[PDB]
């Protein structure tokens, strides 16, 4: 049911569908080292991806429903130069007729234009004043459905954001060639990243789109704050979803010292452009592989690893005393050699028992393979102290809402621009 499917291969891009669409690539198109199937397009002329379709599959009908899907990553807009600068990223418009996706300050837009130059637009709008954003500089699954008889709808991560009737529109033509380049952007240092572009000759429903989201989500591999692959030996800042205005901190080194959530988080501001909350606050959490036999530095589900802690640019270890009072017992950072037989083994957990994707959670386990439990926080005399407990596991068994067993890993990225 797929007509175009741009997928990475041996130092090139090919089409999975049985149509053999011609592909040509510029000399300035880049690829991520770990996840090469994600494509970076910078604001230049040579940064071009041209895909040519077959005359038998060119959209030239008036009742033909069709859908598209892709993954997109849009860096932060830093200055006023980006305001009111609607710039195009994909065109299939010829003779002022076709379909185009474009980007504006906190906006992603679908545009359809028939032979009569009638314009229909569907928009997704995300703010940039928020404390922590789910969209800024993070991967977004954008899919777009077009039913010529009812409406045209936009889906962000599988959920409905906007819909607009298109019954008035007449015959919509499409270009034989489809476009990938930043077009109409005044900013010379603005890029995007794109991943998995798919086209379908029918209107997709909620079920099929959710299935596609889940399929392309790579639920069996851990993800960081920016939606990329989690890697070992890389320093990560830590965020708790349920308490996101505090950061992990230490007070004393060793067992007598406790790691806690200290706050509040600071701010980064640019008056009228962005007023986010600082993400580079606290103590880094390096991940060290223990038993994962995989050659890649990519972290997968159910992996058994160790976690280093960077305190005054020195690397310590997570461990807790298994034998102490209660279940919600305190974790600590200790000298690497002096761990002894303290519980240090952690299991990385992304998808649940049924395989439904959720955020990163770590399960402390002992040498005997007994679950100390999920890592989270609990308040002892007004201090939000880090604890590993099986209470989270109990609520998971009861299908209850666990509180604090969900963590988020934030590496330093150029798309955020914060000063460390």
């Amino acid at each position: 049911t797929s007509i175009l499917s741009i997928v990475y291969k041996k130092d090139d891009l090919i089409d999975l569908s049985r149509y053999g669409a011609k592909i040509n690539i510029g000399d300035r198109v880049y690829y991520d080292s770990i996840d090469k199937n994600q494509i970076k397009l910078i604001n230049l002329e040579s940064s071009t991806i041209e895909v040519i379709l077959k005359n038998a599959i060119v959209y030239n009908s008036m009742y033909e429903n069709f859908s598209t899907s892709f993954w997109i990553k849009i860096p932060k807009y830093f200055s006023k130069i980006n305001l009111n600068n609607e710039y195009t990223i994909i065109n299939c418009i010829e003779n002022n007729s076709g379909w185009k996706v474009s980007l504006n300050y906190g906006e992603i837009i679908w545009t359809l234009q028939d032979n009569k130059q009638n314009i229909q637009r569907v928009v997704f709008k995300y703010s940039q004043m928020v404390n922590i954003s789910d969209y800024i500089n993070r991967w977004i699954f954008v899919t777009i459905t077009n039913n010529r008889l009812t409406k045209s709808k936009i889906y962000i991560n599988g959920r409905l954001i906007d819909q607009k009737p298109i019954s008035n529109l007449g015959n919509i033509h499409a270009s034989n060639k489809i476009m990938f380049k930043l077009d109409g952007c005044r900013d010379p240092r603005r890029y995007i990243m794109i991943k998995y572009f798919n086209l379908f000759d029918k209107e997709l429903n909620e079920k099929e789109i959710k299935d596609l989201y889940d399929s392309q989500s790579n639920s069996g591999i851990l993800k960081d704050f920016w939606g990329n692959y989690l890697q070992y030996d890389k320093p990560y800042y830590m965020l708790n979803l349920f308490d996101p205005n505090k950061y992990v901190d230490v007070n004393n080194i060793g067992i007598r010292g406790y790691m806690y959530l200290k706050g509040p988080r600071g701010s980064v501001v640019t008056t009228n452009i962005y007023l986010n909350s600082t993400l580079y606050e606290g103590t880094k959490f390096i991940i060290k592989k223990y038993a994962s036999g995989n050659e890649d530095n990519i972290v997968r589900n159910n992996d058994r690893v160790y976690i280093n802690v960077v305190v005054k640019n020195k690397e310590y270890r997570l461990a807790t005393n298994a034998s102490q009072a209660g279940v919600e017992k305190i974790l600590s950072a200790l000298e690497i050699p002096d761990v002894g037989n303290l519980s240090q083994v952690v299991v990385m957990k992304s998808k649940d028992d049924q395989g439904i994707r959720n955020k990163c959670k770590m399960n402390l386990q002992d040498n005997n393979g007994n679950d100390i439990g999920f890592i989270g926080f609990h308040l002892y005399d007004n201090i939000a102290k880090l604890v590993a407990s099986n209470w989270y596991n109990r609520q998971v068994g009861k299908a209850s809402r666990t509180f604090g067993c969900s963590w988020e890993f934030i590496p330093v990225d150029d798309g955020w621009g914060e000063s460390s």
Binding site: P264, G266, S267, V268, V269, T270, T271, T278, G417, S419
Partner: protein, 108 residues
């Protein structure tokens, strides 16, 4: 007290530190480039029409201190009680506030 107020219209400053205490002053039209302000107390000091660029404010406590019509670029406010009501009609660009002191939301 208001009669005794001192005024310094215009001053350009290059790389240098600034730990001191000022009382009843107005600095106007200042242009400070990459200047760090460590361990200073401000009592009724106002900066007007000033430009701070790659500045650094640390351990700053201020009473009746304002930054009006000021522009901050790539500046960092570390361990300061300079809350958002002390920047009157200012413009901050790529600026960070870290570890803000505890204080009242308004002037006391």
């Amino acid at each position: 007290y208001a009669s005794r107020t001192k005024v310094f219209p215009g001053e350009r400053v290059e790389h240098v530190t600034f730990n001191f205490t000022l009382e009843n002053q107005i600095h106007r039209g200042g242009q400070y480039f990459n200047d760090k302000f460590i361990g200073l107390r401000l009592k009724s000091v106002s900066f007007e029409d000033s430009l701070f660029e790659e500045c650094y404010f640390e351990d700053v406590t201020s009473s009746n201190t304002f930054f009006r019509n000021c522009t901050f670029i790539n500046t960092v406010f570390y361990n300061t009680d300079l809350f958002e009501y002390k920047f009157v009609n200012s413009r901050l660009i790529n600026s960070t506030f870290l570890h803000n002191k505890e204080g009242c939301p308004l002037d006391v």
